[PDB]
Design a protein around this nucleic acid. Structure first.
Ligand SMILES: [Mg+2]
Ligand SMILES: [Mg+2]
Ligand SMILES: [Mg+2]
Ligand SMILES: [Mg+2]
Ligand SMILES: [Mg+2]
Ligand SMILES: [Mg+2]
Ligand SMILES: [Mg+2]
Ligand SMILES: [Mg+2]
Ligand SMILES: [Mg+2]
Ligand SMILES: [Mg+2]
Ligand SMILES: [Mg+2]
Ligand SMILES: [Mg+2]
Ligand SMILES: [Mg+2]
Ligand SMILES: [Mg+2]
Ligand SMILES: [Mg+2]
Ligand SMILES: [Mg+2]
Ligand SMILES: [Mg+2]
Ligand SMILES: [Mg+2]
Ligand SMILES: [Mg+2]
Ligand SMILES: [Mg+2]
Ligand SMILES: [Mg+2]
Ligand SMILES: [Mg+2]
Ligand SMILES: [Zn+2]
Lengths: 177, 65
RNA sequence: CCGACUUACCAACCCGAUGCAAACUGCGAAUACCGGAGAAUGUUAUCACGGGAGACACACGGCGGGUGCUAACGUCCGUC
RNA sequence: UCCUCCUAAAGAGUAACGGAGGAGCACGAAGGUUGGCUAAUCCUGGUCGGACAUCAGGAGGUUAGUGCAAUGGCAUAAGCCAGCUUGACUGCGAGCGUGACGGCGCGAGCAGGUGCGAAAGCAGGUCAUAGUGAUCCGGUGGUUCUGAAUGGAAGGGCCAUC
RNA sequence: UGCCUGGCGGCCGUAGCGCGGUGGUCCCACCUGACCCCAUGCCGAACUCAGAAGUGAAACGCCGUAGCGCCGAUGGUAGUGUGGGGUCUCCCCAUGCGAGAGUAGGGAACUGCCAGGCAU
RNA sequence: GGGGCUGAUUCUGGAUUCGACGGGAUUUGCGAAACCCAAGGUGCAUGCCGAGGGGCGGUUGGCCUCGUAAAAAGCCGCAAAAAAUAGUCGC
RNA sequence: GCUGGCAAGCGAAUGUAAAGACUGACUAAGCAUGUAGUACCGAGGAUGUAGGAAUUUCGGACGCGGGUUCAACUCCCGCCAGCUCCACCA
C-alpha cells in the first residue's frame, strides 16, 4: 500500500478543491480490483481451466475461484454448473499491491502501448479494461506457457461519477490518452 | 487471508535499464532484472516523433535545378 | 437521378385513452350455508336403535347454465 | 383407474361421447437439523466473446424458481448453497375431516432409543393434491403359540415381507 | 416534565415512493488494523475480535413539499331475495340489501415499554 | 364422410454440407461522409439572372463556363446491335 | 539597374531587382462580401470506421399454427400430403 499511503492525502487535497467537497469521506475512493480469466472454449478439455487457474495464481498470488455457468446458453452448447473461467478479487492491501504492479510494470511486455481508453467507465466510473495477453505481467514468462490468454481487469472504485473516476485515475498517474 | 493454499507473496526486487530498482511484493521468485519500464518508456518520456508526413528523402536536388 | 417526398399500406418498447374473457381478478354484493343469544308458534315435527317395505325409466313450468341453431313437447346439471 | 382448472349458480357436493392438460415416477439425497444467501428481464464498460457465457456497476422487485401437468401457496422463505446425520424410527394415540361400505387422510400428546442446534426447539419423509389393486392361493425369516395317545416333527396361526 | 436517539411491539397502502437540507454534546453508521478464535468453497464484499484519528460523504433519522402511489363520501348506476307482470334469447312495478369505477375531499402516520444522552 | 401407419436414417433431444455462395462480429490502410478544420500559396470567386447539353435528349441546375449571357461538359439514356451458350451428333 | 558620389585596382586580376504599411472604396461584377484574408484544397492544423485479412453459424433432412424446451427434422397437439381400413342391417 505504498502508493496508497503516499497519494491518499495528495489526491484528497486535489479532489476536495477540484469538486468543492466538504468532508474527507466525500472524496472518491477505491473499492476493489477484479480479474477474470474468461476461458470459454474449454468445454472439451478441462486442462485449460487448470492452466487458467495457475496463470492467474501466478499473476496474483491467490487461488482463483472456478466459476460456474448459471444460464446454459445454447449458442455455445453449454450446461449450467460446468466450470467456465476463474475470477480473482483483491481488497485493500492486495488491491494496492497489484495496482502498483499493473501501473509500473505493465509496458515492457506489451506492444503498441499508446495509452488506454478514456471512455472505459460503466456510467459510475468503475474502469473495466482488458488486456490481450498474460505474459505482460512480470511473474509469467513466455517459455513456461503453452496457450495465450488475456484478462478482463476492472478497478472498482467508490467514485460517484465518471469524471470523478477519471480525475481519480489521472491523479493516480494512469496512462490515458 | 486463509491458510497455505495460496503461493508465497514476498517482496522481490526489480531493476530496469534506468534509474529505478523497485522492491514491490510479487510471487515471481527470482529477481526480475527487467527492461524498459513506465518511467522510461517512449510513450511519454522519449521519441514522441511518428510517421506523420516524413516524406521521401530527396536526393535529386543535389545536381542542378 | 441522390429521390423533393407520403405513395386511400404496414409498422418493437414507451405513454394517453376504448372495449372483450368460464378456464383474468388490484376490488366486490343479494341470496345460499355454519355457529352463539332471545321471545312466539308448530300433535317431537329432531336424533339413535330394531321389524317391514317400496324405489335407483321421471316429465313440465320458473330461475343460472353446458350442449343444439340462446331451434325442438330434444338432451344434460342445481333449487322450488 | 387417479390428479389439476372451468362449466359448478360466492359453504360441501353436483352430469354429459363438454371444454383444456397430466399421472402407472425419481431421490440414501431431491429427507431431518443448523448456519448463510436472494432472481427473471433490461441498460452501460470491458481481450478474443458474437442477439448469446465468464466479469464490474445500474433500472426492476418475484414479472424468476418449485424434479414433473395444472390449481392454491412459498421472503420467517416451501426458492439456492455449506457442516453433521438417518425421525424415510418402534408401539400407541385424545380429537376431526371424507366415504353406503371396504376404506383414505390430518393430528396434539405418551413410553423407548436417536439426528441437528450453545439453547429455546425441530424431525413419525419430500410445499400440498396423480405416481396405484380387495380377497383367495402360495414363497421367505422370527415367533411368548397351536402340535388329533405321549416327545418332537409336518402343517396352521401370529409379526415383517414377496 | 418537553428535544431528539436506541431496542421491543401494536397498527401493516391516509402506515409507502420522488424532490428540497439539516442532525454528532449522546446513540448508530462509515472507519483503523488484525498473529489470535473465527471467517471467504478468492479477497475482513458479509460474521467477528481489539478502538475511537476523522466524518455525517453514503446510510439511518428528522422537517416541508399535492409530482406519484393510496384512503375515499353524499347522490346516481349495475345486480338481486320475495310477490305480482310485459312485447319473455330480454325487460317493468311494490319491496328491502344496495356494489365496482369515477367526482367532492383527506393525506407527507399515530401509539406502548424500558434503556441512556440533553434543559429542568 | 370418419379411424390406423408415414412425413425419422433416425426413432436414443444436441449432424460444423469439409467445400462455393448470404450474414455476423475481432485484427489493418484511409477519401469532409471512416473523419473535425481557413492557413501555407496569396487569386480574382461563394452566391446573386445563369445556356441547354457528345450524333440525339436529359439529372438536385449547377458537376462547365463567364462577364452582364452562350458554345453548353464532368454522368445518364440511343448506345456493344461478340448474348447466342457442355459432350455426342448428317450431306 | 541608367545612377548624384568617392575609395583598393585592372586583364596576368569583375556577379547585381526586390517584398516589408494598409491606414481605406474594404477589386470588379448583379448593390454586397475578403485589404492579406476571404472564393479555392492542403498538413497550413490533423484523427478517424467504407472496405482488404483469419473464426463462426445461416442453407437441406419438409408442408405448417404452435408449444416443452438452453435447443430438434428427430417430444407431444392441429393443417395439409402420401399408404391403408370402414362407410353396413333396415
Ligand atoms: Mg352455491
Ligand atoms: Mg327402519
Ligand atoms: Mg331398513
Ligand atoms: Mg342408481
Ligand atoms: Mg338401474
Ligand atoms: Mg318406469
Ligand atoms: Mg331428472
Ligand atoms: Mg327444472
Ligand atoms: Mg333454461
Ligand atoms: Mg326447450
Ligand atoms: Mg328422453
Ligand atoms: Mg362450490
Ligand atoms: Mg433456514
Ligand atoms: Mg446435542
Ligand atoms: Mg410436489
Ligand atoms: Mg380368486
Ligand atoms: Mg403329537
Ligand atoms: Mg412352523
Ligand atoms: Mg447525508
Ligand atoms: Mg350511494
Ligand atoms: Mg362505492
Ligand atoms: Mg371512488
Ligand atoms: Zn526503466
Amino acid at each position: 500500500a505504498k502508493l496508497h499511503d503516499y497519494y491518499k492525502d495528495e489526491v484528497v487535497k486535489k479532489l476536495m478543491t477540484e469538486f468543492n467537497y466538504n468532508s474527507v469521506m466525500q472524496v472518491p475512493r477505491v473499492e476493489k480490483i477484479t480479474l477474470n480469466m474468461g476461458v470459454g472454449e474449454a468445454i472439451a478439455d478441462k486442462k485449460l481451466l487448470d492452466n487458467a487457474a495457475a496463470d492467474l495464481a501466478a499473476i496474483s498470488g491467490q487461488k482463483p475461484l472456478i466459476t460456474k455457468a448459471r444460464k446454459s446458453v445454447a449458442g455455445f452448447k453449454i450446461r449450467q454448473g460446468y466450470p467456465i473461467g476463474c475470477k480473482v478479487t483483491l481488497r485493500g492491501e492486495r488491491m494496492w499491491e497489484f495496482f502498483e504492479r499493473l501501473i509500473t510494470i505493465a509496458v515492457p511486455r506489451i506492444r503498441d502501448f499508446r495509452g488506454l481508453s478514456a471512455k472505459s467507465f460503466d456510467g459510475r466510473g468503475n474502469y473495466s479494461m482488458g488486456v490481450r495477453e498474460q505474459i505482460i505481467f512480470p511473474e509469467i514468462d513466455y517459455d513456461k506457457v503453452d496457450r495465450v490468454r488475456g484478462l478482463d481487469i476492472t478497478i472498482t472504485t467508490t467514485a460517484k461519477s465518471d469524471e470523478e473516476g477519471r480525475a481519480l485515475l489521472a491523479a493516480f498517474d494512469f496512462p490515458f490518452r | 487471508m486463509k491458510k497455505d493454499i495460496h503461493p508465497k507473496y514476498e517482496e522481490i526486487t526489480a531493476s530496469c535499464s534506468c534509474g529505478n530498482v523497485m522492491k514491490i511484493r510479487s510471487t515471481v521468485g527470482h529477481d526480475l532484472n527487467l527492461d524498459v519500464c513506465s518511467k522510461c518508456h517512449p510513450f511519454f518520456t522519449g521519441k514522441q516523433r511518428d510517421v506523420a508526413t516524413g516524406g521521401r528523402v530527396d536526393r535529386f536536388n543535389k545536381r542542378f535545378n
